[PDB]
Amino acid sequence: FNKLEKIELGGTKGKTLTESIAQIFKEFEEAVQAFTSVSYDIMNIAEKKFDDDFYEFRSKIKELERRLASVITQGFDDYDTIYGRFKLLDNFEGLLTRPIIADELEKKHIVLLEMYKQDLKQVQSIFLEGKQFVDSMHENAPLFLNMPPIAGALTWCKSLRDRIQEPIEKLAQLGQGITEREEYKDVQKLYTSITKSIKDYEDQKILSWEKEVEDSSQDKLKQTLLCKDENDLIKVNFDPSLVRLLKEVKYFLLLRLEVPTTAKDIYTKAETYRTQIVALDMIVDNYNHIKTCLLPVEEPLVKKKIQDMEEEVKPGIEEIRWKSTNIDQFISKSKSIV
Amino acid sequence: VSEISWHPEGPTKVAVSYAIMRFQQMPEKMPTQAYVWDLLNPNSPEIKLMSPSAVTNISYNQKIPDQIGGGCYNGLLAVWDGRKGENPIMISPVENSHYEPVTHFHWLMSKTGSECVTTSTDGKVMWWDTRKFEAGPVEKLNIIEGLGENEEIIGGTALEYNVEAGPSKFLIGTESGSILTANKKLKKPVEITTRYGLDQGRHLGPVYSINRSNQNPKYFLSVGDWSCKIWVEDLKTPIIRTKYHGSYLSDGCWSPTRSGAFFLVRRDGWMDVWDYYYRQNEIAFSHKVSDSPLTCIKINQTGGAYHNSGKLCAIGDQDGTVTILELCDSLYTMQPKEKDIINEMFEREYRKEKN
């Protein structure tokens, strides 16, 4: 009873439930004051007066327990969520009054199991509609904001998987062989089937992604920098896929599991690649402005200054190979001439 | 429409920034401009803001009238003037700028000159000075999680700053789902004083929006994945978890006028209003703004003319349409004893959580 006074559930309707709980705690104190006064008594084996008081006290505890069952049942219905109902059970975990409260708990356990069935079905139904969009990379897809599409599917699968397994740890906590209940077993079978489907989809993504990573490695090796149009407007030709593969690897580390094989060297220089691209981008913008923004009279007047730069950068474009980068020196000579 | 902002003086102008959050789904050389709408004429934007790259988030600044600051997809930070629009007066250095697309952009009101704090996907958080962009942000912080000897950098998708909270406390939501609070100190450059939901509050999906009710600074609600949660200032675990929702909740914001009711917009195109004054258990009402998913929701503050605080709410769809909904007078107007009732219930819930 002392533990019951300390409890502060603060769930759904508030104060009126607490006032009823406060009266019940006071009710127990009032019984103690009757029994607490203990005129004569003192647990005498010869005196049978104490036994009569015990029977009267026994009725008072049952009245206290009956009120607790009613308030506890009302609170469970009010939360309307498996997580919310479970939290209330933890608060009253040591407050169960043996068989009186225990009988009410069995009825509560089947209702909680039924709620998890709806969540499992809702997740599964949401998963099937979501899965088709993710594979085709359609707009308004399940993946949150902007992320690598192949990397995102694994992260999205993990979020769905985490929601499904949060209740199972809490469910294993329940006593009185709720596991034996056939309804509980049926829900577990549904949960196992949903998890197996998600892994296969993840395996296809990771499996297909693994093959894509091998193809991507070649793109970094043989992209280089390519100039396009009649005007020599040199621009970075770094495959846009490389950007997704590098950003793809970072998300995998966040979701743990197994990292890609041979994608480490790329991830090792990932910080260096970003710095080099920003430096390379600045000279390219500077080198194109002089090339096409120069006045018609200006180029003819001093053709040698512009031509020397073109001859100077002509070897640089040929030099390009992400395999070995000496852009810092390349950058110093190119930026100074540009 | 990735981000929507309201004019500080009154709800007469809305600034909306358009960008594609999908990775590589943006067409090459796609238009990258921001349009500020006028309530009087909705046929076309009153002014057009031009930026080098698409701006993920743009918000108005109360300190300087008609000044808009936004974060580009490239990570560049740009500032525009509402009266003249056109090109951006202030642009941050590209290389010194934080890598990846800007996640959140907010203005710090506790300064003589407006300052902007930017949190984004590189797991870093930076404070910038509008008057002096100079060589990158003044303060650079990486969001390490779990401290100890294990350090992993996780991108921050949400930044929450409030006047009641003050400049001292900054609320940040990581990609993993945990929430980290960084306290600026004169003595030491940055301190991650509190880690939220490290063990039991971790969200299934990355936290997208973190907000705190204007009426009570201590209580702030973070909308992550299927269901948004509400946490107290000193409790690691969330005080209240509300149901579950179809698809995901892109953004949820507290009503400025009434602390009890907060609005969450789902990615199914349905917006549901949660009111704790009457029934904690169920949604007060659910409305379908559009078939297209709702990327973000912004609620007006203060007000002028015929519009009171919280009367107009702006929600940005994935399609790119922006819809302003006039809320019912009963919902926006404070109900009798709402502030007293919400504080008693929240304190009671907080006491129950501690037990």
XYZ file of C-alpha atoms in Angstrom:
693
model
C 0.000 0.000 0.000
C 2.908 2.405 0.803
C 4.309 1.848 -2.758
C 0.846 2.681 -4.255
C 0.911 6.211 -2.693
C 4.340 6.911 -4.332
C 3.052 5.869 -7.826
C 2.540 8.872 -10.205
C 1.344 7.320 -13.528
C 0.198 10.694 -15.004
C -1.356 8.945 -18.052
C -4.485 10.028 -20.024
C -7.053 11.437 -17.524
C -5.231 12.949 -14.497
C -5.962 14.166 -10.885
C -9.396 12.422 -10.560
C -7.639 9.007 -10.858
C -4.898 10.236 -8.441
C -7.550 11.511 -5.957
C -9.211 8.039 -6.006
C -5.730 6.444 -5.528
C -4.998 8.930 -2.685
C -8.304 7.977 -0.957
C -7.383 4.246 -1.308
C -3.945 4.923 0.279
C -5.709 6.890 3.074
C -8.257 4.018 3.386
C -5.315 1.630 4.105
C -3.909 4.125 6.686
C -7.397 4.312 8.329
C -7.398 0.472 8.623
C -3.872 0.673 10.185
C -5.186 3.300 12.686
C -7.918 0.829 13.768
C -5.452 -2.138 13.759
C -2.562 0.367 14.312
C -4.026 1.426 17.726
C -3.811 -2.310 18.762
C -5.571 -1.981 22.168
C -4.493 -5.166 24.090
C -3.744 -7.706 21.274
C 0.107 -7.685 20.683
C -0.272 -11.040 18.788
C -1.158 -13.041 21.956
C -1.548 -16.769 21.039
C -4.168 -17.155 23.836
C -6.175 -14.023 22.823
C -8.586 -14.692 19.888
C -9.621 -10.977 19.742
C -6.708 -10.286 17.312
C -7.995 -13.037 14.937
C -11.440 -11.317 14.799
C -9.659 -7.993 13.990
C -7.654 -9.808 11.252
C -10.898 -11.008 9.555
C -12.253 -7.412 9.671
C -8.826 -6.239 8.362
C -8.954 -8.990 5.669
C -12.230 -7.501 4.298
C -10.646 -3.986 4.268
C -7.625 -5.225 2.210
C -10.026 -6.936 -0.274
C -12.036 -3.662 -0.560
C -8.718 -1.803 -1.175
C -7.685 -4.463 -3.770
C -11.118 -4.370 -5.520
C -10.834 -0.564 -5.992
C -7.248 -0.993 -7.351
C -8.452 -3.556 -9.947
C -11.127 -1.091 -11.230
C -8.736 1.931 -11.434
C -6.004 -0.281 -13.028
C -8.472 -1.640 -15.668
C -9.714 1.907 -16.522
C -6.103 3.144 -16.974
C -5.163 0.256 -19.324
C -8.152 1.000 -21.644
C -7.379 4.786 -21.533
C -3.734 4.603 -22.772
C -4.849 2.867 -26.068
C -1.204 1.889 -26.971
C 0.942 -1.205 -26.147
C 3.854 1.046 -25.003
C 1.547 3.213 -22.824
C -0.244 0.216 -21.214
C 3.118 -1.549 -20.568
C 4.505 1.570 -18.778
C 1.514 1.486 -16.350
C 2.222 -2.232 -15.604
C 5.881 -1.416 -14.692
C 4.706 1.237 -12.152
C 2.316 -1.291 -10.488
C 4.802 -4.195 -10.980
C 5.371 -4.485 -7.191
C 1.820 -3.263 -6.352
C 0.020 -6.429 -7.609
C -2.087 -7.714 -4.644
C -1.386 -11.447 -5.313
C -4.559 -13.259 -6.610
C -7.059 -10.311 -6.492
C -5.052 -7.983 -8.855
C -3.470 -11.026 -10.623
C -6.853 -12.216 -12.044
C -7.367 -8.739 -13.646
C -3.794 -8.894 -15.109
C -4.575 -12.077 -17.135
C -7.477 -10.243 -18.896
C -5.122 -7.250 -19.513
C -2.408 -9.502 -21.087
C -4.702 -10.903 -23.865
C -5.839 -7.323 -24.766
C -2.169 -6.161 -24.961
C -1.344 -9.156 -27.232
C -4.320 -8.234 -29.501
C -2.957 -4.642 -29.808
C 0.463 -5.968 -30.968
C -1.390 -7.973 -33.686
C -2.787 -4.696 -35.141
C 0.695 -3.053 -35.053
C 2.289 -6.107 -36.768
C -0.464 -6.135 -39.465
C -0.255 -2.309 -39.874
C 3.584 -2.437 -40.202
C 3.322 -5.341 -42.727
C 0.590 -3.593 -44.794
C 2.619 -0.319 -44.694
C 5.801 -2.311 -45.576
C 4.244 -3.907 -48.720
C 2.992 -0.541 -50.106
C 6.337 1.118 -49.168
C 8.530 -1.709 -50.569
C 7.261 -1.287 -54.181
C 8.043 2.495 -54.178
C 11.589 2.013 -52.715
C 12.581 -0.568 -55.401
C 11.457 1.738 -58.285
C 12.916 4.834 -56.460
C 9.526 6.631 -56.952
C 8.748 10.140 -55.509
C 7.238 10.421 -51.957
C 9.138 7.185 -51.056
C 9.343 5.780 -47.461
C 13.046 6.787 -47.048
C 13.250 10.026 -44.961
C 14.370 13.313 -46.662
C 17.417 12.792 -48.964
C 19.774 9.768 -48.562
C 21.527 7.201 -50.864
C 18.648 5.080 -52.311
C 20.337 1.646 -51.869
C 21.805 2.711 -48.469
C 18.428 4.261 -47.477
C 16.465 1.026 -48.055
C 18.658 -0.787 -45.464
C 18.212 2.149 -43.009
C 14.421 2.197 -43.683
C 14.243 -1.609 -43.122
C 16.076 -1.119 -39.767
C 13.540 1.530 -38.605
C 10.603 -0.827 -39.407
C 12.510 -3.751 -37.784
C 13.240 -1.695 -34.603
C 9.518 -0.762 -34.201
C 8.456 -4.457 -34.552
C 11.023 -5.784 -31.989
C 10.569 -3.077 -29.277
C 7.441 -4.900 -27.903
C 9.011 -8.436 -28.020
C 11.599 -7.578 -25.315
C 8.753 -6.150 -23.138
C 6.545 -9.201 -23.970
C 9.243 -11.691 -22.823
C 9.061 -9.804 -19.459
C 5.415 -10.914 -18.823
C 5.070 -13.844 -16.348
C 2.392 -16.559 -15.730
C 3.273 -18.419 -18.980
C 1.604 -15.876 -21.319
C 3.860 -17.700 -23.885
C 1.684 -20.872 -23.514
C -1.413 -18.893 -24.710
C -2.152 -19.964 -28.344
C -3.057 -16.345 -29.311
C 0.412 -15.148 -28.123
C 2.086 -17.934 -30.199
C 0.111 -16.947 -33.362
C 1.327 -13.293 -33.090
C 4.961 -14.519 -32.687
C 4.647 -16.578 -35.936
C 3.404 -13.431 -37.771
C 6.373 -11.416 -36.359
C 8.942 -14.040 -37.529
C 7.460 -14.085 -41.082
C 7.665 -10.238 -41.324
C 11.336 -10.209 -40.151
C 12.388 -12.902 -42.705
C 10.858 -10.939 -45.649
C 12.711 -7.721 -44.587
C 16.134 -9.500 -44.465
C 15.690 -11.006 -47.985
C 14.851 -7.491 -49.311
C 17.877 -6.110 -47.377
C 20.049 -8.985 -48.761
C 18.932 -8.216 -52.350
C 19.728 -4.492 -51.801
C 23.105 -5.241 -50.097
C 23.706 -8.123 -52.601
C 22.802 -5.946 -55.649
C 24.595 -2.969 -53.987
C 27.749 -5.134 -53.516
C 27.835 -5.791 -57.315
C 27.160 -2.043 -57.935
C 30.090 -1.121 -55.597
C 32.487 -3.238 -57.737
C 31.226 -1.412 -60.895
C 31.504 1.966 -59.048
C 35.199 1.309 -58.155
C 35.968 1.276 -61.938
C 34.103 4.615 -62.457
C 36.393 6.407 -59.926
C 39.467 4.783 -61.591
C 38.425 5.852 -65.143
C 36.323 9.082 -64.955
C 39.034 11.854 -65.157
C 38.091 15.473 -66.087
C 36.386 15.991 -69.505
C 35.968 19.339 -71.375
C 32.701 19.672 -73.391
C 31.334 21.936 -76.244
C 33.307 24.059 -78.786
C 34.483 26.311 -75.891
C 37.052 24.622 -73.568
C 34.844 24.836 -70.410
C 36.709 22.091 -68.434
C 34.491 20.682 -65.611
C 34.946 17.787 -63.098
C 33.764 14.512 -64.746
C 33.720 12.653 -61.347
C 30.778 10.228 -61.857
C 27.688 11.406 -59.869
C 27.403 7.700 -58.863
C 30.726 7.997 -56.922
C 29.079 10.692 -54.720
C 26.187 8.282 -53.901
C 28.580 5.333 -53.234
C 30.767 7.429 -50.848
C 27.697 8.918 -49.058
C 26.171 5.382 -49.178
C 29.108 3.928 -47.126
C 28.732 6.501 -44.268
C 25.030 5.533 -43.719
C 26.042 1.819 -43.467
C 28.454 2.655 -40.578
C 25.549 4.439 -38.759
C 23.329 1.305 -39.219
C 26.328 -0.974 -38.268
C 25.865 -4.609 -39.534
C 28.515 -5.495 -42.194
C 30.601 -2.794 -44.008
C 31.451 -3.181 -47.766
C 34.659 -4.984 -48.919
C 37.270 -2.898 -50.929
C 35.152 0.292 -50.411
C 37.368 1.221 -47.386
C 40.182 2.815 -49.488
C 37.473 4.996 -51.151
C 36.008 5.822 -47.691
C 39.579 6.397 -46.362
C 40.151 9.156 -49.000
C 36.482 10.286 -48.817
C 37.470 13.308 -46.651
C 40.430 14.043 -49.024
C 38.212 13.693 -52.155
C 35.765 16.349 -50.819
C 38.621 18.841 -50.122
C 40.207 18.219 -53.583
C 36.844 18.646 -55.424
C 36.166 22.033 -53.719
C 39.713 23.233 -54.616
C 39.374 21.817 -58.187
C 35.928 23.488 -58.585
C 37.291 26.990 -57.714
C 40.093 26.908 -60.374
C 37.661 25.447 -62.996
C 35.246 28.400 -62.487
C 38.242 30.821 -62.662
C 39.701 29.025 -65.748
C 36.374 29.081 -67.681
C 35.625 32.811 -67.064
C 38.961 33.815 -68.728
C 38.303 31.309 -71.588
C 34.815 32.558 -72.656
C 34.277 35.953 -70.874
C 37.426 37.504 -72.479
C 36.623 40.393 -74.918
C 37.012 39.733 -78.710
C 39.635 42.560 -79.101
C 41.462 41.370 -75.903
C 42.175 37.760 -77.075
C 43.651 38.917 -80.449
C 45.755 41.627 -78.698
C 47.372 39.092 -76.275
C 46.784 35.548 -77.701
C 50.038 34.229 -76.106
C 48.880 34.720 -72.469
C 45.595 32.784 -73.083
C 47.293 30.145 -75.347
C 50.103 29.429 -72.807
C 47.438 28.700 -70.126
C 45.667 26.291 -72.562
C 49.009 24.563 -73.370
C 49.771 24.560 -69.598
C 46.371 22.987 -68.733
C 46.455 20.654 -71.808
C 48.826 18.183 -70.002
C 46.779 18.564 -66.785
C 43.565 17.130 -68.363
C 45.625 14.173 -69.758
C 47.235 13.719 -66.283
C 43.788 13.266 -64.565
C 43.343 9.766 -62.976
C 41.844 9.464 -59.446
C 44.375 6.585 -59.045
C 47.173 9.054 -58.020
C 46.408 12.714 -57.124
C 49.146 15.385 -57.012
C 46.474 18.179 -57.293
C 47.986 20.132 -54.365
C 51.050 20.828 -56.554
C 48.866 20.624 -59.664
C 46.531 23.068 -57.822
C 49.366 25.469 -56.844
C 50.685 25.749 -60.450
C 47.155 25.779 -61.996
C 45.642 28.276 -59.493
C 48.649 30.649 -59.803
C 48.551 30.614 -63.656
C 44.683 30.832 -63.637
C 8.461 22.661 -50.479
C 11.179 21.562 -47.983
C 10.784 24.491 -45.516
C 8.081 27.153 -44.799
C 8.601 30.307 -42.640
C 6.240 33.102 -41.424
C 6.859 36.895 -41.472
C 7.988 38.023 -37.953
C 5.906 41.263 -37.765
C 2.599 39.587 -38.781
C 1.039 36.704 -40.794
C 0.882 38.632 -44.126
C 3.914 37.088 -45.943
C 5.161 33.437 -46.033
C 8.668 32.468 -47.270
C 8.853 28.938 -48.806
C 12.081 27.258 -50.065
C 11.861 24.519 -52.766
C 14.423 21.665 -53.051
C 14.401 17.846 -53.578
C 15.503 15.805 -50.502
C 15.561 12.578 -52.600
C 19.199 11.536 -53.277
C 20.052 12.038 -57.031
C 16.315 12.310 -57.991
C 16.803 16.054 -58.748
C 17.039 16.745 -62.544
C 20.354 18.244 -63.800
C 20.196 22.104 -63.932
C 16.788 22.111 -62.119
C 15.390 25.562 -61.103
C 16.769 26.594 -57.652
C 14.812 29.703 -56.517
C 12.757 30.660 -53.407
C 9.429 32.561 -53.694
C 7.884 34.665 -50.862
C 4.036 34.633 -51.137
C 1.619 37.444 -50.097
C -1.745 36.580 -48.440
C -3.568 39.376 -50.367
C -2.581 37.984 -53.828
C -1.989 34.174 -54.072
C -1.929 34.000 -57.920
C 1.900 34.415 -57.981
C 4.774 35.101 -55.496
C 5.122 38.817 -54.553
C 8.962 38.598 -54.835
C 11.476 35.963 -56.096
C 14.742 35.010 -54.292
C 17.551 33.639 -56.544
C 20.291 31.389 -55.051
C 23.337 29.516 -56.516
C 21.840 26.172 -55.310
C 18.357 25.062 -54.117
C 17.767 26.256 -50.493
C 16.656 23.379 -48.187
C 15.506 25.624 -45.264
C 14.660 29.393 -45.220
C 13.358 31.270 -42.122
C 12.533 34.958 -41.361
C 14.517 36.985 -38.760
C 12.638 39.066 -36.101
C 15.705 41.300 -35.348
C 15.929 42.826 -38.886
C 12.627 43.346 -40.814
C 12.205 41.441 -44.136
C 15.588 39.616 -43.906
C 15.664 35.924 -45.024
C 18.562 33.484 -44.397
C 18.697 30.059 -46.083
C 20.898 26.947 -46.423
C 21.622 25.622 -49.957
C 21.682 21.902 -51.019
C 25.497 22.295 -51.632
C 25.911 23.421 -47.957
C 26.411 27.101 -48.899
C 24.677 29.580 -46.517
C 22.930 32.543 -48.215
C 21.069 35.675 -46.955
C 18.427 37.613 -48.980
C 16.536 40.894 -48.314
C 12.715 40.539 -48.510
C 12.123 44.090 -49.830
C 14.515 43.747 -52.839
C 14.704 39.925 -53.208
C 16.804 39.071 -56.328
C 20.381 37.789 -55.601
C 21.698 36.963 -52.059
C 23.796 39.735 -50.369
C 25.769 37.328 -48.088
C 27.172 33.913 -49.233
C 29.465 31.675 -47.068
C 32.750 30.174 -48.461
C 32.065 26.797 -50.231
C 35.137 24.827 -48.983
C 34.908 26.169 -45.372
C 31.115 25.504 -45.527
C 29.861 22.276 -43.846
C 29.598 19.280 -46.272
C 26.210 17.871 -47.564
C 22.792 19.669 -47.737
C 21.853 22.108 -44.905
C 19.325 20.401 -42.554
C 18.156 23.334 -40.348
C 18.732 27.154 -40.408
C 17.682 29.346 -37.427
C 18.382 32.971 -36.303
C 19.753 33.620 -32.771
C 17.743 36.607 -31.422
C 20.028 37.190 -28.383
C 22.539 39.545 -30.141
C 22.931 43.202 -31.290
C 23.416 41.809 -34.836
C 21.388 38.774 -35.988
C 23.410 35.488 -35.932
C 22.496 32.147 -37.595
C 23.141 28.592 -36.244
C 23.168 25.794 -38.884
C 22.880 22.007 -38.189
C 23.178 19.549 -41.115
C 23.918 15.937 -42.285
C 27.749 15.943 -41.804
C 27.272 15.293 -38.040
C 28.573 18.860 -37.426
C 26.781 21.987 -36.044
C 28.021 25.533 -36.845
C 27.237 29.068 -35.531
C 27.690 31.824 -38.175
C 27.846 35.658 -37.944
C 25.713 37.483 -40.589
C 27.739 40.753 -40.335
C 31.096 38.917 -40.739
C 30.823 35.595 -42.692
C 34.684 35.733 -42.983
C 36.506 32.323 -43.075
C 33.644 29.875 -42.274
C 31.476 29.604 -39.109
C 32.814 31.011 -35.778
C 32.061 27.738 -33.882
C 32.420 24.159 -35.283
C 31.032 21.177 -33.270
C 30.891 17.464 -34.318
C 27.951 15.510 -32.754
C 29.887 12.556 -31.177
C 27.464 10.043 -29.542
C 28.021 7.972 -26.345
C 31.233 9.841 -25.330
C 33.676 7.396 -23.659
C 36.247 6.035 -26.164
C 33.690 5.180 -28.917
C 33.098 8.228 -31.177
C 30.734 8.094 -34.214
C 29.716 11.271 -36.125
C 25.901 11.369 -36.674
C 24.260 14.129 -38.785
C 21.831 16.443 -36.949
C 18.445 16.774 -38.721
C 16.755 19.151 -36.218
C 17.848 22.300 -34.287
C 15.572 23.831 -31.588
C 16.264 27.333 -30.131
C 13.832 29.362 -27.940
C 13.990 32.799 -26.182
C 12.635 31.263 -22.920
C 15.381 28.580 -23.166
C 17.801 31.432 -24.063
C 21.127 31.411 -26.019
C 22.784 29.120 -23.411
C 20.863 25.929 -24.438
C 20.666 24.568 -28.041
C 18.508 21.475 -28.839
C 19.855 19.150 -31.622
C 18.318 15.917 -33.042
C 20.723 13.310 -34.556
C 20.189 10.941 -37.567
C 20.435 7.899 -35.206
C 17.341 9.153 -33.272
C 18.964 10.435 -30.042
C 18.743 14.173 -29.111
C 21.894 16.063 -27.957
C 21.862 19.487 -26.204
C 24.932 21.717 -26.789
C 25.599 24.591 -24.324
C 27.726 27.510 -25.647
C 30.370 28.575 -23.063
C 32.785 31.544 -23.008
C 35.301 29.284 -21.117
C 35.128 26.200 -23.466
C 33.987 26.317 -27.149
C 31.119 23.750 -26.967
C 29.700 21.270 -24.393
C 27.173 18.429 -25.107
C 25.669 18.723 -21.571
C 22.662 16.370 -21.999
C 22.017 13.263 -24.177
C 18.259 12.558 -24.667
C 16.820 9.037 -25.047
C 20.286 7.439 -25.328
C 18.837 4.061 -24.173
C 14.977 4.073 -24.109
C 14.195 7.213 -26.171
C 16.031 6.230 -29.381
C 13.662 6.833 -32.353
C 13.180 4.065 -34.988
C 13.787 6.718 -37.719
C 15.850 9.974 -37.707
C 14.246 12.876 -35.737
C 13.006 15.485 -38.267
C 11.477 18.300 -36.155
C 12.249 19.362 -32.537
C 10.004 22.098 -31.034
C 9.035 23.433 -27.554
C 5.626 24.978 -26.654
C 5.774 28.815 -26.469
C 3.634 28.799 -23.259
C 5.991 26.394 -21.376
C 9.736 26.326 -22.338
C 10.540 23.248 -20.169
C 8.302 20.917 -22.258
C 9.499 20.294 -25.862
C 8.149 17.643 -28.309
C 10.370 15.888 -30.916
C 8.606 14.354 -33.979
C 10.532 11.218 -35.043
C 9.455 8.400 -37.442
C 5.866 7.067 -36.854
C 5.136 8.781 -33.482
C 6.340 12.143 -32.021
C 7.348 12.145 -28.298
C 7.379 14.871 -25.556
C 10.389 15.129 -23.162
C 10.932 17.225 -19.972
C 14.116 19.369 -19.575
C 15.878 17.054 -17.043
C 14.513 13.569 -17.980
C 16.489 11.400 -20.475
C 13.339 9.331 -21.336
C 10.264 10.908 -23.073
C 7.446 11.947 -20.648
C 4.640 10.997 -23.117
C 4.644 8.877 -26.336
C 1.528 9.494 -28.488
C 0.085 6.463 -30.389
C 1.622 5.623 -33.835
C 0.865 7.160 -37.275
C 0.442 6.088 -40.932
C 3.667 6.525 -42.992
C 5.968 9.013 -41.148
C 5.512 12.467 -39.533
C 7.606 14.996 -41.520
C 7.067 17.903 -39.054
C 5.140 18.640 -35.800
C 4.843 22.098 -34.149
C 3.267 23.295 -30.834
C 0.473 25.910 -31.102
C 1.918 29.306 -29.976
C -1.485 30.503 -28.608
C -2.384 27.255 -26.736
C 0.192 24.973 -24.981
C -2.223 21.986 -24.766
C -2.712 21.362 -28.524
C 0.179 20.540 -30.946
C -0.201 19.772 -34.713
C 1.682 16.934 -36.522
C 1.608 16.570 -40.357
C 2.044 12.972 -41.665
C 3.794 11.916 -44.942
C 0.460 10.315 -46.098
C -0.852 13.850 -46.891
C -3.016 13.814 -43.721
C -2.592 16.405 -40.909
C -3.891 15.391 -37.430
C -4.238 17.844 -34.476
C -3.475 16.387 -30.999
C -5.256 18.244 -28.142
C -4.308 17.153 -24.579
C -6.837 19.517 -22.915
C -9.810 17.203 -23.684
C -8.646 13.668 -24.663
C -5.002 12.443 -24.342
C -5.948 9.016 -25.868
C -7.214 10.139 -29.337
C -6.520 12.796 -32.055
C -8.828 15.843 -31.760
C -9.404 15.742 -35.570
C -7.685 14.524 -38.798
C -7.668 16.532 -42.085
C -6.262 15.532 -45.530
C -4.453 18.645 -46.906
C -3.509 16.937 -50.229
C -2.789 13.543 -51.912
C 0.934 14.516 -52.080
C 2.994 13.983 -48.844
C 3.313 17.044 -46.521
C 7.072 17.921 -46.283
C 6.694 20.553 -43.489
C 4.178 22.561 -41.350
C 4.693 26.119 -39.964
C 2.285 27.957 -37.577
C 2.146 31.811 -37.491
C 3.079 33.690 -34.260
C 1.807 37.081 -32.913
C -0.356 38.640 -35.663
C -2.127 41.678 -37.174
C -5.404 42.802 -38.842
C -8.077 40.024 -38.848
C -5.570 37.216 -38.049
C -4.901 36.202 -34.387
C -2.018 33.959 -33.171
C -2.336 30.344 -34.455
C -5.297 31.165 -36.775
C -3.301 30.385 -39.977
C -1.094 27.264 -40.468
C 1.111 26.770 -43.583
C 1.876 23.162 -44.725
C 4.229 22.382 -47.657
C 3.310 19.387 -49.884
C 5.824 17.130 -51.771
C 4.078 18.264 -55.038
C 5.184 21.871 -54.241
C 1.781 23.416 -53.456
C 1.596 25.404 -50.152
C -1.805 25.543 -48.369
C -2.799 27.966 -45.549
C -5.584 26.520 -43.326
C -7.622 28.794 -41.016
C -8.023 26.829 -37.737
C -11.337 26.827 -35.790
C -11.599 29.709 -33.250
C -12.114 27.218 -30.355
C -8.838 25.390 -31.221
C -6.693 28.593 -31.450
C -8.372 30.462 -28.516
C -7.100 29.381 -25.055
C -9.782 27.287 -23.239
C -10.517 28.088 -19.535
C -7.671 26.888 -17.181
C -5.735 25.270 -20.101
C -2.323 26.487 -18.799
C -3.049 25.328 -15.206
C -4.451 21.929 -16.376
C -1.563 21.202 -18.818
C 1.115 22.048 -16.173
C -0.545 19.774 -13.560
C -0.883 16.881 -16.070
C 2.700 17.303 -17.416
C 4.183 17.541 -13.883
C 2.108 14.468 -12.857
C 3.335 12.557 -15.961
C 6.930 13.690 -15.187
C 6.583 12.465 -11.561
C 5.175 9.113 -12.817
C 8.139 8.746 -15.254
C 10.661 9.419 -12.429
C 9.033 6.659 -10.290
